[PDB]
Design an enzyme around this catalytic site. Structure first.
Site, PDB file in Angstrom:
ATOM      1  N   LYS B  12     -38.071 -62.526  25.009  1.00  0.00           N
ATOM      2  CA  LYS B  12     -36.692 -62.394  24.614  1.00  0.00           C
ATOM      3  C   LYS B  12     -36.554 -62.425  23.111  1.00  0.00           C
ATOM      4  O   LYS B  12     -37.370 -63.039  22.408  1.00  0.00           O
ATOM      5  CB  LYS B  12     -35.786 -63.375  25.312  1.00  0.00           C
ATOM      6  CG  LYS B  12     -35.870 -63.250  26.836  1.00  0.00           C
ATOM      7  CD  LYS B  12     -34.721 -63.932  27.562  1.00  0.00           C
ATOM      8  CE  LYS B  12     -34.371 -63.261  28.884  1.00  0.00           C
ATOM      9  NZ  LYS B  12     -32.928 -63.294  29.185  1.00  0.00           N
ATOM     10  N   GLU B  89     -30.469 -66.504  32.994  1.00  0.00           N
ATOM     11  CA  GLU B  89     -29.661 -66.294  31.806  1.00  0.00           C
ATOM     12  C   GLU B  89     -28.592 -65.226  32.026  1.00  0.00           C
ATOM     13  O   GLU B  89     -27.476 -65.316  31.505  1.00  0.00           O
ATOM     14  CB  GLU B  89     -30.521 -65.981  30.573  1.00  0.00           C
ATOM     15  CG  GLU B  89     -29.718 -65.981  29.266  1.00  0.00           C
ATOM     16  CD  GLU B  89     -29.840 -64.690  28.507  1.00  0.00           C
ATOM     17  OE1 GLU B  89     -30.249 -63.658  29.009  1.00  0.00           O
ATOM     18  OE2 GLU B  89     -29.517 -64.811  27.242  1.00  0.00           O
TER      19      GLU B  89
END
Lengths: 242, 242
Positions: B12, B89
């Site tokens: 990420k 997420e």
């Protein structure tokens, strides 16, 4: 009265470059004739871009999560002096403790940056009636490395983690409570003059509709919009800070 | 016996490309002698670089979003055949429901993609004894938009959401328990065949010390390493699948 408002957009990775692009153009074309401080936060991969395209006078650019002293220096030199630290997903996924978060904030503030510190409790924390102790424990961590003077460089952003995708919904009234709670400890711990000119942003789910009622709250001084809340409607949010 | 394992690294953006670059080098230099599928999922931005630097035969690139025929088309043409969907997420911060996820998954599969679907419950859910109801529900949603044939392109990744930044710590035994439950449903709902070949990755905190133990479980087929667990020691994790 209320200090100077702050409307910040917290942009992150799994969001496209085009998406970021379109947004910036929107902001640029937008007119803001009131006293408000807009901010565009972005990950490392986009800092350069938004830096080159953002031209609105009421806007500033900010980074996210910089801790390393060298990293800070670069930002400063690169023309970026605003930083967002302690976001919910940082603490959760990246194991950023109140300590780690406190350390960073102190570093940034030392580098001359303007900091947006995020704090908030989770569902289980709220449920168990640990809201107070929790939020206060966090703020205390931070305040433990700052001087009374450093606070002029700090912005607090309350994150209702308990309402992040949990199905729960924080009413404007609940937010006010948290904010009031935060402002108290400060006035009591740091000082009245400090708590007076301190910005406490609402980092929950906001939109064009609720942004108004939210802002009409005594201890609410802005927003920290991100996630699914981050869309062209951001413009509307800005206006709500009247 | 066990199905071919998978070692997925979920990168990420909050972490510079340098960290990524450095990682790629590591991976390219590493020697893998067993039948294992390695994967490097990354956000949009670094997709290009990753593709340009990654050269290990045991690796493959993977996207992290969308179902938009255009997006899929592009990716497919760009040389990306794997995709990661349903990450905690996402469901939490981006408002991705069981249905949204199910849809995406269906799209990707139709576009000839290999999918890594994330499912998992939260602390509150587990603490409330909702564990089975939740995870079963999540998977049921995905399953309903698929045919028995599509399952060959499906990979389940179990996320111990309740263990993510909560203070709680999941054991390899608590995992096997979850994996076992998932597989069971698949066995009776879809079929033993499918269930037998189905890959189930543990997507929680893991390292070089617990990796082997985790992989030791009979219903654990790999890992979905991300966040702080994403260190250069990912190499050790790969070996734990030997």
């Amino acid at each position: 009265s209320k200090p100077q408002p702050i409307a910040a957009a917290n942009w992150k990775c799994n969001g496209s470059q085009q998406s970021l692009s379109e947004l910036i153009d929107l902001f640029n074309s937008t007119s803001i004739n009131h006293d408000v401080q807009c901010v565009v936060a972005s990950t490392s991969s986009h800092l350069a871009m938004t830096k080159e395209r953002l031209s609105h006078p009421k806007f500033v650019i900010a980074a996210q999560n910089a801790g390393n002293a060298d990293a800070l220096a670069s930002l400063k030199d690169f023309g970026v002096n605003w930083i967002v630290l302690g976001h919910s997903e940082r603490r959760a996924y990246y194991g950023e403790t109140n300590e780690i978060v406190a350390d960073k904030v102190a570093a940034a503030v030392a580098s001359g940056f303007m900091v947006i510190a995020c704090i908030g409790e989770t569902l289980q924390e709220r449920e168990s009636g640990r809201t107070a102790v929790v939020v206060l424990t966090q703020i205390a961590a931070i305040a433990k490395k700052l001087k009374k003077a450093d606070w002029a460089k700090v912005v607090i952003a309350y994150e209702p983690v308990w309402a992040i995708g949990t199905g729960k919904v924080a009413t404007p009234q609940q937010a006010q409570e948290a904010h009031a709670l935060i402002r108290s400890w400060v006035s009591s711990k740091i000082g009245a003059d400090v708590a007076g000119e301190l910005r406490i942003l609402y980092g929950g789910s906001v939109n064009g509709k609720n942004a108004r009622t939210l802002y009409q709250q005594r201890d609410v001084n802005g927003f920290l919009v991100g996630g699914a809340s981050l869309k062209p409607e951001f413009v509307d949010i800005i206006k709500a800070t009247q």
